Design a protein around this motif. Structure first.
Motif, short mmCIF file in Angstrom:
data_model
loop_
_atom_site.label_atom_id
_atom_site.label_comp_id
_atom_site.label_asym_id
_atom_site.label_seq_id
_atom_site.Cartn_x
_atom_site.Cartn_y
_atom_site.Cartn_z
N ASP A 138 0.82 -1.22 0.00
CA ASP A 138 0.00 0.00 0.00
C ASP A 138 0.85 1.25 0.00
O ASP A 138 0.48 2.29 -0.57
N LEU A 139 2.00 1.16 0.64
CA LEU A 139 2.89 2.31 0.79
C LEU A 139 4.36 1.92 0.61
O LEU A 139 4.75 0.85 1.06
N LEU A 140 5.12 2.80 -0.01
CA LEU A 140 6.59 2.73 -0.09
C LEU A 140 7.18 4.05 0.47
O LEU A 140 6.92 5.12 -0.11
N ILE A 141 7.95 3.99 1.55
CA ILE A 141 8.58 5.16 2.14
C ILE A 141 10.05 5.12 1.73
O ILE A 141 10.78 4.22 2.10
N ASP A 142 10.47 6.08 0.92
CA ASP A 142 11.72 5.97 0.21
C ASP A 142 12.19 7.37 -0.14
O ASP A 142 11.40 8.21 -0.56
N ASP A 143 13.45 7.64 0.07
CA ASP A 143 14.03 8.99 -0.20
C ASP A 143 14.37 9.25 -1.67
O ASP A 143 14.72 10.36 -2.03
N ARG A 144 14.29 8.22 -2.52
CA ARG A 144 14.59 8.41 -3.93
C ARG A 144 13.36 8.94 -4.66
O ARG A 144 12.33 8.30 -4.60
N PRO A 145 13.44 10.09 -5.34
CA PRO A 145 12.25 10.66 -6.00
C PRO A 145 11.69 9.84 -7.18
O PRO A 145 10.46 9.67 -7.29
N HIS A 158 4.04 5.94 -3.34
CA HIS A 158 5.38 6.40 -2.91
C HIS A 158 5.28 7.64 -2.04
O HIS A 158 4.82 8.68 -2.52
N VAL A 159 5.69 7.53 -0.77
CA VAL A 159 5.81 8.72 0.10
C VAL A 159 7.27 9.06 0.15
O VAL A 159 8.08 8.18 0.51
N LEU A 160 7.63 10.28 -0.29
CA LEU A 160 9.01 10.69 -0.29
C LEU A 160 9.53 11.01 1.11
O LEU A 160 9.05 11.93 1.75
N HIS A 165 19.43 15.45 -0.20
CA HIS A 165 19.49 15.51 -1.65
C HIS A 165 18.16 15.85 -2.30
O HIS A 165 18.11 16.26 -3.44
N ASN A 166 17.06 15.67 -1.58
CA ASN A 166 15.73 15.93 -2.13
C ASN A 166 14.94 17.03 -1.39
O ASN A 166 13.82 17.32 -1.76
N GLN A 167 15.51 17.64 -0.37
CA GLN A 167 14.73 18.51 0.50
C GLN A 167 14.22 19.75 -0.24
O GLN A 167 13.24 20.34 0.19
N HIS A 168 14.86 20.09 -1.37
CA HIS A 168 14.49 21.29 -2.11
C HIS A 168 13.52 21.03 -3.22
O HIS A 168 12.99 21.98 -3.83
N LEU A 169 13.24 19.74 -3.45
CA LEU A 169 12.50 19.32 -4.61
C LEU A 169 11.02 19.58 -4.53
O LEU A 169 10.32 19.09 -3.65
N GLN A 170 10.50 20.25 -5.54
CA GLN A 170 9.07 20.40 -5.63
C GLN A 170 8.51 19.14 -6.32
O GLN A 170 8.96 18.78 -7.39
N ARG A 176 3.52 13.15 -1.93
CA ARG A 176 3.46 13.43 -0.49
C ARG A 176 4.79 13.06 0.19
O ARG A 176 5.43 12.13 -0.25
N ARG A 177 5.15 13.72 1.29
CA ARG A 177 6.42 13.51 1.98
C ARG A 177 6.24 13.06 3.39
O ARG A 177 5.32 13.49 4.06
N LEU A 178 7.18 12.24 3.87
CA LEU A 178 7.35 12.07 5.30
C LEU A 178 8.64 12.77 5.62
O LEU A 178 9.71 12.44 5.10
N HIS A 179 8.56 13.76 6.49
CA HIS A 179 9.63 14.70 6.59
C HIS A 179 10.82 14.23 7.45
O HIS A 179 11.98 14.68 7.27
#
Ligand SMILES: O=c1ccn([C@H]2C[C@H](O)[C@@H](COP(=O)(O)O)O2)c(=O)[nH]1
Ligand SMILES: O=c1ccn([C@H]2C[C@H](O)[C@@H](COP(=O)(O)O)O2)c(=O)[nH]1
Ligand SMILES: [Mg+2]
Ligand SMILES: [Mg+2]
Lengths: 194, 194
Positions: A138-145, A158-160, A165-170, A176-179
């Motif tokens: 149902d969900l993938l929590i992953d830092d790769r955009p 995919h929840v970013l 490396h991605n904090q600036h990315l729109q 959606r993000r998990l911060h």
């Protein structure tokens, strides 16, 4: 009926960026480096490569070295959060991680790391794959955009997970993000339950 | 749109049964053993255990030893068939394998084995997981009769690959077998294409 959540390892559970920078600096004290605040893009090696020739290959030699993966520190709150998450009713957690090309140490150390922080019983929850789109959840929590592969329509959302490396990315709006693990991961999970 | 096929490793690509029996006999020449024609049930260790106490643990020590997985011989036709299968248009092949609990050698040797027989580029196609039901595909070719886990409704059709331990098993009718790599695996694949 059970909610299934894939949690990525490097950049989510394990502090790949900090561990890499530390080891890079100690091994190559006379080369320039990328401060974490200056990291951009998933591919560390490509940014180091643009910085000065031969640096891609020096970057790679850090994570190809023995004990690199094993000695990564957990990110703040990661182990606590995943343990809580897995103990929740109707919730199955898998750790989904992509090994590097050079396979002498990395698979082994990744299993050893999971054993160290989550215990022997959590080893059954590890999925090693270069293609995450063929793992259903149902969900993938992953830092790769950009998470792509053989399945054009993955079943997970995919929840970013935020990283340097991605904090600036729109992101394109539905995304959606998990911060951080201090952020409200329980609300994200609940939003996917019936 | 591309057909996705998961091919299991032990008992399908790699001759686990023959390699195990050989090594067991050489290491423990004064113990009784199970001839391949007499094998029944997926779990080797359980049959050896029923045969005489302490034998489960002796069986386990064979596949926990260094070089056990690496030195497995390919089953007849396996490497040729998978190579042909992957080269087919609109066909993606992943090798899906479950490592043992003891992780010092097995993950590493499995990657090394795949490199040896299929080449470096095939390493991207490996999925290591204890739960196959969370890997999505059209087909799973696997010698284990009972494939269960977290997903109650896997997307793949399980085709039972014949092995000594399952050759006598009557399957519940919709279920289907691939009898060896000499059998017509192309027809099975084609039956799942639109
Ligand atoms: O420039 C890079 C950055 C990362 N990785 C690899 C390291 C890890 O094996 C994988 C990411 O691991 P996970 O986030 O999937 O755990 O990508 C590279 O090969 N090159
Ligand atoms: O009695 C047994 C028989 C097999 N296996 C393990 C060995 C392999 O790691 C896995 C099967 O590997 P694959 O068929 O999934 O490749 O099951 C056991 O632990 N006990
Ligand atoms: Mg990551
Ligand atoms: Mg098998």
């Amino acid at each position: 009926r059970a909610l299934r959540v894939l949690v990525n390892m490097d950049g989510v559970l394990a502090d790949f960026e900090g561990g890499f920078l530390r080891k890079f600096r100690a091994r190559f004290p006379d080369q320039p480096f990328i401060a974490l605040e200056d990291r951009r893009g998933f591919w560390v090696s490509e940014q180091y490569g643009r910085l000065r020739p031969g640096l891609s290959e020096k970057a790679i030699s850090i994570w190809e070295s023995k004990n690199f993966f094993f000695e990564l520190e957990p990110l703040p709150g990661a182990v606590e959060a995943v343990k809580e998450m897995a103990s929740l009713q109707n919730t199955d957690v898998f750790i989904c991680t992509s090994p590097i090309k050079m396979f002498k140490y990395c698979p082994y150390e990744k299993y050893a790391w999971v054993e160290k922080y989550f215990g022997p019983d959590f080893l059954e929850q590890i999925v090693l794959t270069r293609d995450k789109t063929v793992v259903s959840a149902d969900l993938l929590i992953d830092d790769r955009p950009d998470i792509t592969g053989a399945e054009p329509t993955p079943s997970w959302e995919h929840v970013l997970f935020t990283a340097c490396h991605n904090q600036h990315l729109q992101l394109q709006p539905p995304r959606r993000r998990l911060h951080s693990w201090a952020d409200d991961w329980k609300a994200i999970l609940d939003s996917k339950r019936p």
